[PDB]
Amino acid sequence: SDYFGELFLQAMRTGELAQAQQLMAGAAQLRLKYGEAVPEIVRLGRGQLGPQLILVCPTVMTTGPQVYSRLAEELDAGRRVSALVPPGFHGGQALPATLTVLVRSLADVVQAEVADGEFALAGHSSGGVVAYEVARELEARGLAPRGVVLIDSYSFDGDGGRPEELFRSALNERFVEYLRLTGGGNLSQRITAQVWCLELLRGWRPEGLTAPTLYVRPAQPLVEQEKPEWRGDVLAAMGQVVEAPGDHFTIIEGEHVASTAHIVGDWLREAHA
Amino acid sequence: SDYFGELFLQAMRTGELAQAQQLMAGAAQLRLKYGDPAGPEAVPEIVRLGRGQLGPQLILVCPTVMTTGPQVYSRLAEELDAGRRVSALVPPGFHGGQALPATLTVLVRSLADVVQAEVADGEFALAGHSSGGVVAYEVARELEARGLAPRGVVLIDSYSFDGDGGRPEELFRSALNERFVEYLRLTGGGNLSQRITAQVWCLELLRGWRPEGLTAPTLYVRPAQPLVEQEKPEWRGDVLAAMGQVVEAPGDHFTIIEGEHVASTAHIVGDWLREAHA
């Protein structure tokens, strides 16, 4: 346990989660920032041949290569799959001062990974958001990603609202449960990094990308009061939108990863073809 | 593990003590409290410090700060140990499992319960350094309301922040904090967040405090040397104006009861107490 981490866990159980969030935000503000960390890139699965697929891990407390373990395995046939980990969630890593800093750090690692070979990017939620931004930056540098896949990416409108609180609370339930089960440590380090990084993405809209995009939408929502505005401007810039069985999280967990990978893999094969 | 404790220390070195205390205050609000009449109450620890087993009792109330405990008073008690029975009373929430008192009333009555049981019908007096002087004053008021008769209260450099405060307050708090933290680093101190949250919680209960309604005589001991240049006179003004006697003594806010000046401070306090018990 962490001292403030235990208070955060306790707050959830007592209906004081709003105050606990404010604390993690204040801590995130105090944390060291850079802008000089080099984001981790990890090979997933065994494939040694074919185009490279880079899975950008989400900027949330559970982040790490393992979030994509099932998904990578399903996609491992005839391609080289890697997970790219945003800095600040593990070890002694500083947080990126700005979204531009984050995106540049990650683009530099991808550039070095792929050189001039064919590649594509994919990401779940905030990972999809960040994948799209990294793609844009690589296109500015003259690279040509073959596609970007975003899995249920959303962007919060305005400054807040009650639907937002309920949705974030539902996300938080699953994040914390994963870490409890995963055995995950450094709870304050992980939550402060999440709070910092998600704030960088507030009001994000896809501004233009030459590579084709695929948006995968889970058939099942998390809560009743989800606002269409959260996805509307995102969807509008997507080249293709596909509904898939599962919810925000199970879409890439045991029960639905197979159909998700089928849709993603088929699209990626077309994209490279 | 204690990430925010680590952030607190970092923030000191980068001049963000104010933001860090704001974080600790928020956490303090989340911490479990005691005070509900039906729920379980934390019992404040009392500790004999004297070798002396004879004479009137002297109850030293430990300050509600991150370094709190009987050792802050070891030297003072050793100087005062002849002819009186010295004890140290430690406010709850700083160590172990302990919950924080819900309100100042809860704190004062928890402490007064312990003093009550300790002194029975014997002669006694209270003293405290800084916030411990403030709390000793309130505990004395409470005991007087319960029919007991403390022979006196000694406050050493007690002050009160009034209003929201500005740059002077931050500068004074930073100087205090520097000494608190150094002591903790020297005593191998652990559990930073537990100690600091409790400090920030308790010192907030004392914001805007002024003394009124005590019948026992009071002595205020004022260190001759300030901690910083920008010290506002309003911090002590109202406290002082209610003191029976005010005595200046060599030393600063802390060194007043440290090895350098503890002998001269005890002579002043000791002489007053004996005068008071007669």
Side-chain angles (χ1 to χ4, degrees), chain B residues 13 16 35 54 66 68 76 128 136 147 165 218 228-229:
Chain B
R13 285 180 302 266
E16 299 169 281
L54 196 70
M66 66 176 84
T68 195
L76 185 57
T218 49
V228 296
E229 175 187 359

Side-chain angles (χ1 to χ4, degrees), chain A residues 7-271:
Chain A
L7 291 180
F8 183 96
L9 295 174
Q10 191 50 69
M12 295 168 65
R13 267 179 274 111
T14 55
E16 286 280 317
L17 176 67
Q19 231 280 67
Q21 213 85 306
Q22 193 167 271
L23 263 35
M24 295 296 187
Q29 199 62 241
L30 275 176
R31 278 187 62 166
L32 209 83
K33 266 125 206 149
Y34 76 92
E36 288 105 340
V38 189
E40 179 149 4
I41 189 159
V42 172
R43 195 59 82 77
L44 295 180
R46 297 287 159 86
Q48 298 209 81
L49 302 174
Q52 284 164 290
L53 170 60
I54 297 184
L55 303 184
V56 180
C57 298
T59 57
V60 293
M61 64 176 85
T62 57
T63 202
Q66 179 93 76
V67 308
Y68 292 138
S69 287
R70 316 287 268 98
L71 183 62
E73 288 176 36
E74 289 300 320
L75 292 170
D76 194 12
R79 58 166 73 78
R80 295 173 280 161
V81 188
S82 297
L84 172 77
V85 180
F89 292 82
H90 303 73
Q93 288 179 321
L95 287 167
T98 65
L99 185 52
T100 293
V101 167
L102 177 52
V103 169
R104 176 182 74 234
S105 291
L106 305 162
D108 289 352
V109 171
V110 174
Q111 194 164 8
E113 182 70 16
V114 306
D116 30 63
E118 274 189 319
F119 75 106
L121 291 163
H124 174 256
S125 203
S126 56
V129 172
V130 169
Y132 185 98
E133 294 296 314
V134 166
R136 283 183 66 230
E137 176 59 27
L138 302 167
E139 292 187 349
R141 300 175 187 195
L143 266 70
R146 290 305 210 116
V148 181
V149 181
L150 300 78
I151 308 177
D152 208 31
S153 298
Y154 64 84
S155 187
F156 287 132
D157 63 325
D159 45 20
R162 181 173 181 266
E164 173 175 338
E165 296 175 55
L166 291 171
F167 182 76
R168 292 163 70 103
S169 180
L171 291 177
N172 188 71
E173 182 217 55
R174 310 260 180 126
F175 292 151
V176 164
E177 183 54 8
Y178 182 93
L179 292 175
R180 191 197 64 91
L181 286 173
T182 255
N186 315 307
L187 189 57
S188 294
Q189 177 163 1
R190 287 177 171 278
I191 301 171
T192 57
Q194 167 178 313
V195 165
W196 180 256
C197 289
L198 295 175
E199 205 60 22
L200 298 172
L201 302 182
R202 220 191 154 83
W204 172 83
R205 47 176 145 260
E207 278 292 310
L209 180 62
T210 51
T213 45
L214 172 62
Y215 187 105
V216 182
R217 183 171 193 146
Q220 177 182 17
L222 281 173
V223 291
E224 270 138 16
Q225 320 84 346
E226 313 200 356
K227 294 167 76 163
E229 294 88 329
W230 297 345
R231 287 176 183 92
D233 280 339
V234 180
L235 296 175
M238 298 294 102
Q240 197 170 319
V241 183
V242 181
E243 202 190 69
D247 73 25
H248 178 76
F249 301 101
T250 63
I251 194 126
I252 61 162
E253 290 164 6
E255 63 199 323
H256 302 292
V257 72
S259 54
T260 298
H262 193 259
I263 294 155
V264 173
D266 282 355
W267 190 84
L268 285 167
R269 253 183 307 297
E270 185 57 44

Side-chain angles (χ1 to χ4, degrees), chain B residues 17-32:
Chain B
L17 181 57
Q19 298 101 282
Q21 298 205 282
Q22 189 189 357
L23 260 54
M24 293 294 178
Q29 282 277 350
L30 284 173
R31 277 189 61 175
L32 209 81

Side-chain angles (χ1 to χ4, degrees), chain B residues 35 55 63 67 71 96 104 155 181 189 192-193 235 276:
Chain B
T67 58
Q71 290 211 0
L104 183 58
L155 296 82
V181 172
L192 272 212
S193 281
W235 298 341

